[PDB]
Amino acid sequence: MDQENERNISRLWRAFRTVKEMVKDRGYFITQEEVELPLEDFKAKYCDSMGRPQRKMMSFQANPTEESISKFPDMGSLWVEFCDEPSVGVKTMKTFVIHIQEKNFQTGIFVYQNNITPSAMKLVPSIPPATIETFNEAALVVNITHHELVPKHIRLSSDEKRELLKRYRLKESQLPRIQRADPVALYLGLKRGEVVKIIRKSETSGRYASYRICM
Amino acid sequence: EAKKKVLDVTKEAQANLLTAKHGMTLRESFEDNVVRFLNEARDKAGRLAEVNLKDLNNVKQMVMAGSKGSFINIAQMSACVGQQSV
Amino acid sequence: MTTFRFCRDCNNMLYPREDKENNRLLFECRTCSYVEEAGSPLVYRHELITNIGETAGVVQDIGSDPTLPRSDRECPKCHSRENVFFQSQQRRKDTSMVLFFVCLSCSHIFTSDQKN
Amino acid sequence: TPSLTVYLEPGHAADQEQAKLIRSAIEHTTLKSVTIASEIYYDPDPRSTVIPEDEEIIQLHFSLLDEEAEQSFDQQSPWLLRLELDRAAMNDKDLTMGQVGERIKQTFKNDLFVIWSEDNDEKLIIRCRVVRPKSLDAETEAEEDHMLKKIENTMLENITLRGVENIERVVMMKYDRKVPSPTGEYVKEPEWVLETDGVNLSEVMTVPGIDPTRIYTNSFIDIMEVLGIEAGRAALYKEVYNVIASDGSYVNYRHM
Amino acid sequence: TKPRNSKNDGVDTAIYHHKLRDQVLKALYDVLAKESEHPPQSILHTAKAIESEMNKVNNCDTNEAAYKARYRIIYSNVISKNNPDLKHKIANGDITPEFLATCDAKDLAPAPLKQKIEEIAKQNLYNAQGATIERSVTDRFTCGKCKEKKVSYYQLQTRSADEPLTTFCTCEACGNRWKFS
């Protein structure tokens, strides 16, 4: 039992928990017990006799809650799948794309270990209206949203956006803006033209609410 | 007495007996000790000279009222100027 | 401690070479036919950090420098009480403040740190 | 002067030992830093030497090498990286001689094999002998020094034993937090923190044994890249307020 | 008369028909019996015990790297000429085979190297500390946050020379800072 084995196992377990937290934060249905799964059960289930982490059995499908469907009628099921290869080949990406398309899933999460070939990512935007998003493994070990300096963000519906825009009597190009590559935007999976509300603490009033638009 | 303390620290450091402080070179330790000793000496002398003064002193009256000066000015004009730095 | 060796013909430094059939090291001059037999397998040396004791530097005629201080410490060899004293003349950042004494008569060097 | 302040876990906060383990696990360690004499020496026949000190180490591994090493005896370079290694520097980073000295080094490119002693010898001597195929060209095989000096420099400079890149120094410090006591009032409680000299926030954040929710740096661009734009705004506010208020001046909050 | 060893003492080393085990037993028996006057039978029994412990605590077929590392550690400790007393103890039985199985590298060292090791550890732990900025202590100014008069000071000619010196007072009990001019 070389130390690198359990080091990699622990980091992979951390990434799995972080991905579960992200999927829960996107409005889906995930139990609290499943989030707090101890590493012993993780080793018992997702490791072979030799201790090799069997990533391929971790792929799972998630469905939205009642509240998320009520707020977002267009929201649909999501699929997440891990890749065992150190580098993702073109054939593997094509197989994943075909699997997502035949499952008729609106969005999917593809977590890769080290690198992806350019021809593989050539196929990312080729399946409308489905959306394919990639997350490097080394960047999901620690949950960003749990920091002290990151306030709490919320997503707004079309009706809420229209009501705010009317009440403040504004055109969408005058609100403050947030980029796409912004880490919290990737976490929440915001597309172009969506408004995110921010709740923050303040020395002068206690609580304060700001708004931003994804450009 | 401050001069004697500084001289004793110099004697200790010249015999390779002085110990370097936390994460900080030996020369810096010697310099730090000397500077601290001299500054405390100046402050204490200033406070003695300030406590001596009566209530019918005009400079003390101006300082007490809050209009012009402080105890540093009294210390330099009366007790001692101190350590010039660059 | 590797030492430069010069060829006896044209004063050029000798480059190393190997002798496979006898398996022995030689020093040859690339300009002439001189070849000499190596006496040790030590040809080059590359140290990284210098554990050198601090040195007083040049000592010759140091007693005629009138800007150098004095002391009344007693000589350990000639029992004289007049000498010159100064700090280490090597300008490293981390050098300690250990003195050096040069006796006036016997020109003997010693230090104020008498570590056993 | 970029910097980075790391706060340890709640359990390890009050004890110095776990703090020093983390400090060793963060700082960047490279071979050139741990050799008191990484001396390039002539090693014509590695079978035997004139120096008595390395002679004792000779018979250790010569009775401790596998059959493949016995076959590869001829691959060892006619020059040696003779490593007199400093005991203090090696023990400072909690660096075991064998595992760290050889596992990663031979795994990287299968370029340099070693005859190494156990740490108990009074003089820690490693014999770094590079490994090359015998199929090397005659002109190549003649120029032993030419290949080996270059590969020795690339060996010292470009091998990382342990740590994270760009972090020159990591230093221990003691601070005084204020915490609600169980009876309800606020009490002063000491804690151990690590302050670096150099910033690499993407990799320090994932090192186990620290608090990944209280890390901070005085380089708000990195915080903007890693944590978001509101986090960058908060960090920028802290920087501006710090620089203004470090002079004792007071400027109302609305302006800043 | 002759250096005692497996070939000299005429003791068979092939008991478990394992090549690696056979050669490591031969080597350890030879190095143990070379400079020991103890009878060879108990030496062979101790060798059997230690090799059985090595095999049982770690299978060579699955952990050959760790097996080789442990064998190298023990063998280097045995050959170590700085501390000959150990080859007495293993001959005498003072050091149990399980202790050698579980012990780390440091404890097998002699006393002087041990002491040097703790001294080095203490020096490193002292050298990993940061610069302590100890400020001048005084008891005249009153802090506005905790009102503890243990407030340090620092005064300098920094403002324009049209005005007197400027002082800055920092409370060492709570962290408050202020300026007087």
Side-chain angles (χ1 to χ4, degrees):
Chain A
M1 183 177 176
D2 199 1
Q3 43 79 36
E4 186 172 0
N5 204 15
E6 73 263 20
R7 285 184 58 252
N8 296 7
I9 279 171
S10 80
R11 292 184 73 186
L12 188 152
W13 160 58
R14 277 168 154 200
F16 182 79
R17 171 170 173 160
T18 298
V19 162
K20 273 219 188 296
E21 278 181 0
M22 153 177 305
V23 176
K24 189 177 173 188
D25 280 330
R26 279 187 196 209
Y28 289 112
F29 175 53
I30 297 175
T31 68
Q32 190 67 27
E33 191 271 337
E34 201 181 2
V35 173
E36 306 265 32
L37 188 143
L39 74 164
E40 321 295 334
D41 291 331
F42 160 71
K43 266 166 175 177
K45 259 190 184 172
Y46 302 145
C47 293
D48 59 351
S49 61
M50 283 73 74
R52 296 278 84 82
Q54 291 325 286
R55 307 174 161 92
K56 271 323 170 173
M57 74 182 321
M58 301 166 127
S59 315
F60 60 86
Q61 153 178 352
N63 305 323
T65 64
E66 306 181 359
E67 202 269 349
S68 284
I69 294 170
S70 172
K71 198 169 187 180
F72 299 89
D74 63 358
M75 185 180 288
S77 43
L78 159 66
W79 176 268
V80 60
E81 173 165 307
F82 292 76
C83 178
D84 274 325
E85 308 174 14
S87 298
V88 173
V90 178
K91 176 186 177 184
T92 308
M93 176 61 76
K94 185 155 103 203
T95 300
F96 166 73
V97 159
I98 287 310
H99 171 40
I100 290 290
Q101 177 48 53
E102 64 91 17
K103 290 296 191 183
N104 297 318
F105 283 152
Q106 297 103 329
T107 187
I109 297 169
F110 200 77
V111 176
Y112 75 97
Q113 300 173 348
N114 200 317
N115 271 324
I116 284 184
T117 55
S119 297
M121 43 175 172
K122 265 188 173 186
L123 277 297
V124 176
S126 65
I127 312 96
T131 67
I132 293 171
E133 40 267 35
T134 181
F135 300 105
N136 193 303
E137 186 156 289
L140 277 296
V141 161
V142 185
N143 200 10
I144 299 299
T145 307
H146 273 189
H147 208 273
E148 56 180 8
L149 291 190
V150 171
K152 52 167 299 181
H153 312 68
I154 314 190
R155 218 173 55 175
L156 286 147
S157 81
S158 308
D159 204 319
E160 284 150 327
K161 176 195 171 72
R162 288 190 194 99
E163 195 69 10
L164 171 142
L165 201 68
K166 156 176 182 189
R167 206 50 63 192
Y168 282 87
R169 292 174 258 99
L170 265 182
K171 299 168 188 177
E172 63 178 348
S173 64
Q174 291 146 310
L175 285 149
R177 308 188 280 249
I178 178 177
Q179 304 175 318
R180 308 187 79 266
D182 200 0
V184 187
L186 309 154
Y187 190 100
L188 290 144
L190 297 154
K191 293 175 183 65
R192 198 180 159 283
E194 279 161 332
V195 188
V196 54
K197 159 175 185 190
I198 312 184
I199 294 281
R200 192 197 313 144
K201 308 295 184 192
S202 175
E203 317 178 341
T204 54
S205 81
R207 57 196 186 180
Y208 177 47
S210 176
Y211 303 83
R212 300 212 169 207
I213 62 170
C214 185
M215 68 190 185
Chain B
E1 84 174 5
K3 269 183 196 184
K4 307 324 168 274
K5 286 198 206 162
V6 161
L7 169 56
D8 283 6
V9 176
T10 300
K11 272 202 201 150
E12 160 188 314
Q14 266 169 357
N16 208 356
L17 299 157
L18 190 145
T19 306
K21 294 179 184 178
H22 270 204
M24 181 195 138
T25 309
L26 189 153
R27 306 269 203 153
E28 298 179 6
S29 308
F30 173 67
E31 291 302 323
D32 189 75
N33 287 349
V34 178
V35 168
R36 194 183 322 286
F37 289 174
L38 300 189
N39 282 0
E40 308 282 37
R42 182 202 81 228
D43 184 13
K44 175 193 182 62
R47 194 61 80 171
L48 296 186
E50 190 272 334
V51 171
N52 170 40
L53 291 178
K54 310 180 180 166
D55 221 345
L56 55 85
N57 205 71
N58 316 125
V59 183
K60 207 200 190 176
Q61 280 165 15
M62 271 185 317
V63 167
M64 270 186 317
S67 62
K68 218 63 180 166
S70 186
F71 64 93
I72 305 167
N73 315 94
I74 314 165
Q76 312 217 60
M77 319 184 257
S78 46
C80 73
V81 176
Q83 164 77 33
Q84 301 312 303
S85 75
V86 162
Chain C
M1 182 305 288
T2 175
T3 306
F4 282 22
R5 251 179 297 279
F6 306 133
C7 171
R8 199 66 268 171
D9 295 345
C10 47
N11 277 332
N12 289 58
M13 51 86 88
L14 290 173
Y15 299 84
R17 200 175 38 78
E18 204 182 40
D19 184 15
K20 180 67 174 66
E21 62 271 15
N22 314 67
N23 316 68
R24 70 175 198 271
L25 271 300
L26 302 165
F27 288 133
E28 70 168 7
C29 174
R30 214 72 62 88
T31 61
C32 58
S33 296
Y34 192 104
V35 176
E36 202 283 339
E37 71 76 20
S40 189
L42 183 68
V43 307
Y44 173 78
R45 178 200 187 80
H46 173 212
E47 83 277 20
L48 258 62
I49 58 187
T50 61
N51 196 33
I52 61 171
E54 294 294 328
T55 308
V58 180
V59 176
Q60 313 284 60
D61 194 351
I62 210 167
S64 79
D65 172 4
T67 68
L68 267 174
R70 295 291 210 266
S71 160
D72 293 28
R73 190 182 296 273
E74 187 261 343
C75 186
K77 186 180 289 293
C78 76
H79 308 326
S80 193
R81 303 210 97 221
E82 271 86 330
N83 57 62
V84 180
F85 88 94
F86 52 84
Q87 207 163 101
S88 169
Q89 282 185 14
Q90 190 270 333
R91 295 301 190 209
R92 194 162 46 98
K93 178 186 295 290
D94 214 323
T95 45
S96 57
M97 274 180 46
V98 295
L99 281 184
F100 285 84
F101 285 75
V102 183
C103 183
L104 202 66
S105 282
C106 61
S107 75
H108 175 49
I109 188 167
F110 51 106
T111 72
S112 76
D113 195 14
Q114 312 292 19
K115 296 293 183 182
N116 278 314
Chain D
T1 61
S3 163
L4 163 56
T5 300
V6 176
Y7 291 89
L8 313 171
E9 277 193 354
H12 312 356
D15 186 74
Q16 203 168 341
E17 295 309 318
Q18 293 82 17
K20 203 183 168 64
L21 277 71
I22 302 286
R23 177 250 183 176
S24 304
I26 301 299
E27 181 154 37
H28 194 231
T29 314
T30 190
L31 185 49
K32 176 203 170 193
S33 60
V34 66
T35 70
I36 191 172
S38 68
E39 293 158 336
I40 302 175
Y41 282 145
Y42 214 77
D43 187 74
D45 207 46
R47 292 206 151 277
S48 50
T49 190
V50 182
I51 315 164
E53 304 173 349
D54 302 340
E55 276 154 32
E56 282 191 19
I57 297 172
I58 288 180
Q59 77 258 4
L60 304 179
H61 266 265
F62 283 8
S63 52
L64 273 158
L65 282 192
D66 293 330
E67 293 191 340
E68 316 189 337
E70 294 170 356
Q71 297 151 62
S72 83
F73 282 163
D74 311 337
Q75 294 194 278
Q76 283 154 19
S77 186
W79 285 74
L80 173 63
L81 171 69
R82 199 174 153 274
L83 293 180
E84 184 174 301
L85 304 190
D86 205 20
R87 187 75 58 103
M90 181 85 47
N91 285 127
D92 197 352
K93 316 292 214 311
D94 284 280
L95 216 51
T96 179
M97 178 89 98
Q99 195 268 351
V100 188
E102 282 80 12
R103 184 260 307 162
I104 190 67
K105 182 174 66 58
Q106 293 192 40
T107 293
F108 177 71
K109 201 171 73 176
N110 192 26
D111 50 352
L112 171 63
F113 168 72
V114 162
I115 298 300
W116 41 278
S117 57
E118 190 185 352
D119 285 286
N120 298 122
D121 51 349
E122 183 145 7
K123 294 322 161 83
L124 304 177
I125 308 314
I126 291 172
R127 289 185 169 184
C128 293
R129 317 157 168 186
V130 297
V131 293
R132 298 88 61 209
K134 291 182 183 179
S135 57
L136 281 192
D137 309 352
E139 284 192 350
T140 296
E141 283 172 339
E143 304 182 346
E144 310 158 357
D145 190 17
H146 181 90
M147 62 195 78
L148 58 89
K149 272 198 176 86
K150 298 178 166 187
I151 70 177
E152 184 270 345
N153 286 300
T154 313
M155 191 206 57
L156 293 175
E157 282 182 317
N158 303 7
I159 296 170
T160 61
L161 306 169
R162 226 196 170 190
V164 183
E165 321 186 350
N166 286 125
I167 305 178
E168 204 203 336
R169 303 157 39 85
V170 178
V171 159
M172 308 198 99
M173 271 315 327
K174 207 188 193 163
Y175 286 158
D176 285 343
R177 218 180 164 178
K178 277 204 168 169
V179 178
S181 68
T183 184
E185 42 176 347
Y186 275 81
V187 285
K188 294 167 190 184
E189 159 184 359
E191 198 155 331
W192 283 96
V193 303
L194 302 167
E195 52 183 53
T196 81
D197 191 332
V199 54
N200 184 345
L201 186 147
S202 187
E203 295 297 331
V204 175
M205 181 155 178
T206 59
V207 164
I210 69 175
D211 206 345
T213 81
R214 299 211 301 117
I215 190 153
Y216 166 78
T217 176
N218 76 338
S219 179
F220 42 93
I221 318 170
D222 308 71
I223 297 170
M224 204 264 278
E225 293 149 4
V226 183
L227 291 151
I229 184 52
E230 51 275 10
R233 163 192 190 283
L236 168 48
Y237 174 65
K238 276 182 176 56
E239 277 315 305
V240 179
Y241 166 71
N242 268 350
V243 60
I244 295 170
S246 289
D247 209 338
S249 298
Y250 173 75
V251 163
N252 195 251
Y253 169 76
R254 295 151 163 81
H255 313 330
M256 307 192 283
Chain E
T1 58
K2 285 180 183 172
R4 295 175 55 191
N5 52 72
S6 168
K7 309 183 179 188
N8 274 9
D9 295 330
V11 172
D12 192 8
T13 56
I15 320 293
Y16 293 99
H17 65 279
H18 199 271
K19 276 181 173 171
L20 282 73
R21 304 185 78 178
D22 280 337
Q23 53 204 150
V24 304
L25 288 175
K26 185 169 194 145
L28 61 86
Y29 182 76
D30 293 337
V31 298
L32 175 45
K34 260 180 194 161
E35 59 267 0
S36 65
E37 203 259 332
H38 192 274
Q41 272 321 302
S42 179
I43 293 167
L44 175 69
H45 294 88
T46 316
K48 289 166 172 177
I50 65 183
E51 66 92 27
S52 61
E53 190 139 18
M54 295 298 102
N55 187 79
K56 74 169 59 71
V57 304
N58 211 5
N59 191 22
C60 181
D61 310 314
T62 56
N63 277 329
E64 65 274 15
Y67 214 81
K68 281 165 176 172
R70 292 297 293 157
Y71 166 45
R72 190 199 279 96
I73 286 299
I74 301 155
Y75 194 11
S76 50
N77 285 291
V78 176
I79 308 177
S80 309
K81 316 180 180 181
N82 196 6
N83 45 359
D85 292 334
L86 62 94
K87 69 96 172 178
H88 302 167
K89 293 197 164 192
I90 182 62
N92 280 17
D94 309 350
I95 310 302
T96 77
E98 44 272 23
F99 182 76
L100 295 175
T102 61
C103 204
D104 80 323
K106 193 267 177 165
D107 191 24
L108 266 52
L113 286 161
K114 278 184 175 175
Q115 176 193 2
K116 278 188 182 180
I117 279 171
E118 289 91 7
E119 208 274 347
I120 290 171
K122 181 266 290 181
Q123 181 72 12
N124 290 347
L125 186 62
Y126 180 87
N127 265 355
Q129 309 261 316
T132 64
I133 42 172
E134 191 271 333
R135 306 213 182 122
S136 297
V137 186
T138 189
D139 52 341
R140 294 71 170 260
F141 292 110
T142 315
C143 171
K145 183 178 159 194
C146 66
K147 271 207 168 174
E148 273 199 18
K149 277 196 149 210
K150 302 177 190 129
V151 164
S152 57
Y153 64 71
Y154 63 93
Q155 303 134 20
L156 206 62
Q157 173 60 268
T158 64
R159 186 180 295 275
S160 44
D162 297 331
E163 305 211 354
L165 309 192
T166 316
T167 184
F168 293 97
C169 311
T170 314
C171 185
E172 297 260 345
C174 63
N176 183 228
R177 306 192 174 209
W178 75 76
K179 73 179 296 297
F180 277 167
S181 65

